[PDB]
Design a protein around this nucleic acid. Structure first.
Ligand SMILES: [Mg+2]
Ligand SMILES: [Mg+2]
Ligand SMILES: [Mg+2]
Ligand SMILES: [Mg+2]
Ligand SMILES: [Mg+2]
Ligand SMILES: [Mg+2]
Length: 153
RNA sequence: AACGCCCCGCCGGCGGAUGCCUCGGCCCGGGCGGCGACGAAGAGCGCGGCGGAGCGCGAGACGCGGUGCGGACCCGCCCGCCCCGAGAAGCACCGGCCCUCGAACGCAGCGCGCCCCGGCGCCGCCGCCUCGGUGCCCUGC
């Protein structure tokens, strides 16, 4: 189920399936964390948790507002999604543990080298409308996978 | 610029086409041609060691008995059987049990009577018992 393959063979990996969090917010968080060192990534996520840093939105941004914390990132939009941050922190911790124990590597040389977020099937509820009509009220879950390795280049 | 968007070369999702397969359908031929007041068809409610639906069965209830054949298992856990008959699974025929409604029969539908002994519905045919008539007669008075 992993979309990432290579001969590096010194990579830690983790994944979760059917995560009950918004797919778009999680995609943005994972794209934001990519290319960072693991320690910096943990610091950044914790900072996002209390509105010290922001998550820039590059893909799903139609209603996202402009904020000054996004200055200097390539876009003027961003938000502070918390459910996504909690989930991504869990998965990253698991991947780091898998890399350190399997290959005995230390945490100061590990980077976030790959990610992938895919849409999943959600639970269906219903809502009631005027003149005796019924509509749908579904959710938008996702599958997440994170890879940690030595260095991009 | 970069992003976003749109187009190639690999890898993942979402969805369920296609192909192959089917103890099912549809047509044609043959046989049969058999229900019921001795309570039918149908409905309700119950019945299993652990038991919801369906099948089956009826307070003898997930079955009882008889006569033949059969010959080692019994879908789970248990219990049981094991044998030159000592008898698990299966099969055929026969005898019984057979709650409440229903043509539905003491009234009524969940309540209540009559009766003296136990039993108490309607219509018809035959027969018997007990009777009525200023019907046709007769006798006695
Ligand atoms: Mg708009
Ligand atoms: Mg409404
Ligand atoms: Mg209405
Ligand atoms: Mg049942
Ligand atoms: Mg009756
Ligand atoms: Mg009656």
């Amino acid at each position: 189920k992993y979309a990432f393959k290579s001969d590096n063979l010194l990579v830690g990996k983790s994944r979760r399936d059917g995560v009950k969090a918004s797919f778009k917010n999680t995609y943005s968080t994972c794209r934001a964390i990519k290319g960072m060192g693991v320690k910096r990534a943990f610091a950044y996520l914790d900072n996002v948790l209390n509105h010290k840093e922001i998550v820039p939105f590059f893909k799903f941004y139609k209603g996202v507002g402009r904020h000054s914390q996004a200055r200097g990132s390539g876009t003027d939009k961003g938000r502070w999604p918390e459910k996504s941050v909690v989930v991504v922190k869990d998965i990253l911790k698991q991947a780091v543990s898998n890399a350190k124990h399997a290959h005995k590597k230390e945490e100061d040389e590990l980077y976030v080298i790959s990610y992938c977020v895919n849409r999943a099937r959600g639970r269906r509820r219903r809502t009631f409308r005027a003149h005796g009509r019924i509509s749908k009220y579904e959710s938008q879950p996702c599958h997440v996978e994170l890879i940690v390795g030595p260095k991009p280049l």
